[PDB]
Paper text:
Inherited missense mutations in the myocilin (MYOC) gene, within its olfactomedin (OLF) domain, constitute the strongest genetic link to primary open-angle glaucoma via a toxic gain of function, and thus MYOC is an attractive precision-medicine target. Myocilin has no known function, and there is no glaucoma phenotype in Myoc knockout mice or in individuals with a homozygous N-terminal truncation mutation or hemizygous deletion of MYOC, but rare non-synonymous coding mutations lead to toxic intracellular sequestration of misfolded myocilin. Among the common features associated with pathogenic myocilin misfolding, we demonstrate that a single metric, OLF thermal stability, can robustly segregate benign from early-onset disease variants.
At the outset of our study, five variants could be confidently predicted as benign polymorphisms: T293K, T353I, K398R, A445V and K500R. These mutations are all found on the protein surface and well documented in the literature. Three of these variants harbor conservative substitutions (Lys to Arg, Ala to Val). Modestly lower levels than WT were detected for T293K, E352K, K398R, N420Y and A427T. Structural integrity was further confirmed by high-resolution crystal structures, which were solved for 11 OLF variants. No gross changes from WT OLF were detected for the structures of T293K, R296H, L303I, V329M, S331L, E352K, T353I, K398R, A445V, V449I or K500R, indicating that these mutations are accommodated within the native five-bladed β-propeller fold and do not perturb the dinuclear calcium-containing site.
Numbering used by the authors: 244 to 502
The structure:
């Protein structure tokens, strides 16, 4: 049930971090859950600091919203920024101070693949507008795994590549005309990249679209509210058909409508 994004709902706060370590972070669910996890399993990473390794795992939504983790994973290498995703049983994350994406299989706590994203800027070269070393943003949509980044050759414009989820090979690449540092974040729905204009405003917008199927770029004016005035992470979950975001300590979700 795909289409163009035409509306974003009000943010709903599901959990609030209680310490500075969670001012920024990433939380997610697996759109292709695999044993022993389910569509309720949630992962949370508080990403302030320089040695981020703890991944909080919750078996049930109730636990994510009110309790302690069911399990804590300690990653073998520190993680960079807020761009990570979970897909088909693995956490895909960027190694700190690198352009390396790592596939970490959660049930075995094993690194199964690593890949430098060719030519990608990293560690503050092509972040989103808030900074935060957000140079490399993973994404899952209806067709699988992607990565959003930029390169010198692209002159800082958003590049996105489809990824093989097993071995992290790049399968196809598209170049937009959207300056990555000029937008607050981005996500992919049904093969179209969308960007958000501001990470602080209550009256931000989803302001650009790039359709990988047609090559066409568009401007948009869909309202987008940053309720807590500092959104560090905005991703799309194609199973729930919702946006998942992190806004100034708060793990929030937005409903959407597609044409
Ligand atoms: Ca994103
Ligand atoms: Na991401």
């Amino acid at each position: 049930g795909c289409g163009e994004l035409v509306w974003v709902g009000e943010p709903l706060t599901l959990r609030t971090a209680e310490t500075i370590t969670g001012k920024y972070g990433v939380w997610m669910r697996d759109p292709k859950p695999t044993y022993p996890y389910t569509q309720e399993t949630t992962w949370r990473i508080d990403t302030v600091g320089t040695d981020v390794r703890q991944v909080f795992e919750y078996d049930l939504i109730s636990q994510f919203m009110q309790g302690y983790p069911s399990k804590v994973h300690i990653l073998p290498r520190p993680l960079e920024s807020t761009g990570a995703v979970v897909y088909s049983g693995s956490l895909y994350f960027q190694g700190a101070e690198s352009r390396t994406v790592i596939r970490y299989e959660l049930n075995t706590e094993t690194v199964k693949a690593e890949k430098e994203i060719p030519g990608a800027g990293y560690h503050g070269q092509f972040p989103y507008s808030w900074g935060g070393y957000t140079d490399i943003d993973l994404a899952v949509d209806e067709a699988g795994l992607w990565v959003i980044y930029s390169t010198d050759e692209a002159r800082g414009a958003i590049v996105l590549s489809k990824l093989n989820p097993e071995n992290l090979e790049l399968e196809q690449t598209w170049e937009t005309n959207i300056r990555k540092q000029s937008v607050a974040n981005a996500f992919i729905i049904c093969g179209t990249l969308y960007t958000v204009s501001s990470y602080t405003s209550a009256d931000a917008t989803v302001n650009f679209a790039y359709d990988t199927g047609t090559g066409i770029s568009k401007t948009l004016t869909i309202p987008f509210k940053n309720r807590y005035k500092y959104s560090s992470m905005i991703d799309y979950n194609p199973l729930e058909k919702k946006l998942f975001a992190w806004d100034n300590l708060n793990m929030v979700t937005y409903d959407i409508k597609l044409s």
